[PDB]
Design a protein around this ligand. Structure first.
Ligand SMILES: C=CC[C@H](C(=O)N1CCCC[C@H]1C(=O)O[C@H](CCc1ccc(OC)c(OC)c1)c1cccc(OCC(=O)O)c1)c1cc(OC)c(OC)c(OC)c1
Ligand code: NA
Length: 128
């Protein structure tokens, strides 16, 4: 399925090249610009534990998910991965625990050492 495809074909967008954040573009966006640290980003997404459990549809097409990029308002994998997106782009993002909740997890929802998968659509972004 989609997580396996990102394992096999995904691009490693980590600084360390440790495969901790793997990406596939599923729909190409518009233009060339991608958001800078401090930009406000507006997203629709859905995600899960990579093994299918704990599905999150809270922002799948209803109210946008909003945060300021590169400020640690989200897990590291998102500050890294949403930064690479164009407006209108949809990507698949596979996130190892060191870029997500680590060995701590976020119990009971996220277990210790969990890999996460997201389908993310960047709707817009704007300067601070
Ligand atoms: C299948 C994945 C679960 C998903 C998740 O991991 N997400 C949500 C979508 C963005 C990526 C990731 C996330 O970053 O979630 C945070 C959790 C809180 C948080 C933020 C920063 C952290 O480190 C810098 C961190 O370490 C523990 C914990 C999140 C959830 C909801 C919103 C949010 O930001 C936008 C906002 O506050 O509106 C951010 C999620 C979704 C949640 O609510 C929809 C969560 O709150 C109950 C949640 O808590 C752990 C986790
Ligand atoms: Na806002």
């Amino acid at each position: 399925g989609a997580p396996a495809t990102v394992t096999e074909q995904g691009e490693d967008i980590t600084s360390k090249k440790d495969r901790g954040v793997l990406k596939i573009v599923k729909r190409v966006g518009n233009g060339e610009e991608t958001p800078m640290i401090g930009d406000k980003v507006y997203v629709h997404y859905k995600g899960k534990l990579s093994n299918g459990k704990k599905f999150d549809s809270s922002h799948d097409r209803n109210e946008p998910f909003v945060f300021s990029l590169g400020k640690g308002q989200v897990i590291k994998a998102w500050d890294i991965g949403v930064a690479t997106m164009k407006k209108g782009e949809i990507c698949h993002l596979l996130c190892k625990p060191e870029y997500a909740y680590g060995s701590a997890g976020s119990l009971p929802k996220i277990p210790s050492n969990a890999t996460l998968f997201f389908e993310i659509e960047l709707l817009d972004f704007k300067g601070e």
